[PDB]
Structure 1
Amino acid sequence: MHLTPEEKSAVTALWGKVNVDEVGGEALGRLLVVYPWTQRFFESFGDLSTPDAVMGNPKVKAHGKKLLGAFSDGLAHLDNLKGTFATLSELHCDKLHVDPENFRLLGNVLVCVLAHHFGKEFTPPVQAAYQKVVAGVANALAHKYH
């Protein structure tokens, strides 16, 4: 991924303030609420009948912590997203059968969650930097589809 020194510092500085468990649970929850077709992979998680049921589902929170943890690790390798996520890409294509459009949806929900979480500190230039990063991550997760 190609970001300027300014963009990278802005991403890293904000991320230091993020509770990865809390934010990951929130972002996955909102994905399944706002775009409910994304629930198709998670029937084994149990009760997704209402927004509160989604947001309070412990299996949703658990998965959310797991994927944002991998994301979080990605931020340390902004210069090699493709290589960092190569094996996850294969896994999502070949075994999980996840349409990569879902990664783009999650990216946009994540940006909304950060804005909600950080309010005025999530300035337009900081948003712009995170938009590059989530498109970068979605592209890297989609890279090995065939």
Structure 2
Amino acid sequence: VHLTPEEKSAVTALWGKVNVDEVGGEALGRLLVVYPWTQRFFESFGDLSTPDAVMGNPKVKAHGKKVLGAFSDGLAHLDNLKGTFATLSELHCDKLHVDPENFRLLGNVLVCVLAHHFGKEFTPPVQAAYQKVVAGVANALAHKYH
């Protein structure tokens, strides 16, 4: 991160609005639906064989808040994105072996979810701010693959 003041202003001001019980899960769910391979990783979670079954699965919404959790952690800890995420990187890297590109994918589906939720309030400059952030985050988790 850098995040200029105005970008900062824009990331922080949306995140305040965000329904953290229900946004994290709309994005984990969208991932499993949009990118089916990733459901490899949640066989433990129940029926995902239809996306309706993915989007009202309680483990799926259970987990997705954990995931927005970590984002809230990173989003306002941008100075050491890397410090913050090490433990998590370790878990997904040399523990669940999740290829780092799904980290961009979640990132981007997250950007989709926010755009769907905020509509017009999600202007291109704000999106631009968020891209950097989701990037920083995908890069922080994937750092123990090195």
Percentage of matched positions with identical amino acids? 99
**Displaced runs of 4 or more, over 6 A:** none
**SS where residue 22 of structure 2 aligns?**
helix
Query: Once the 2 structures are TM-superposed, how far is the Cα of residue 84 of structure 1 from its aligned partner?
Result: 0.8
Q: Encode CA deviations 1:25-75: one digit per residue, 9 max, x unaligned.
A: 100010001111110000010100111000001111111111111111111
Deviation at 1:130, TM superposition (A): 0.4
Matched position secondary structure for 1:85:
helix
CA distance in 2, matches of 1:21, 1:99: 26
Alpha-carbon distance, 1:2 to partner: 1.7
Scaled by the length of structure 1, what TM-score is found?
A: 0.97
2-structure distance, mates of 1:91, 1:28: 17
Gaps of 5+ in 1: none
Structure 1 vs Structure 2 CA RMSD: 0.8
Q: Which runs of 5+ in 2 are unaligned?
A: none
CA distance in 1, matches of 2:84, 2:128: 22
Q: C-alpha distance in 2, partners of 1:88/1:113? A: 22
Task: Out of 15-24 and 79-88, give the one that drifted further.
Answer: 79-88
Q: Summarize deviations over 1:63-117 as a string: whole Å, max 9, x none.
A: 1111111111111101110111112111211111111111100011000100100
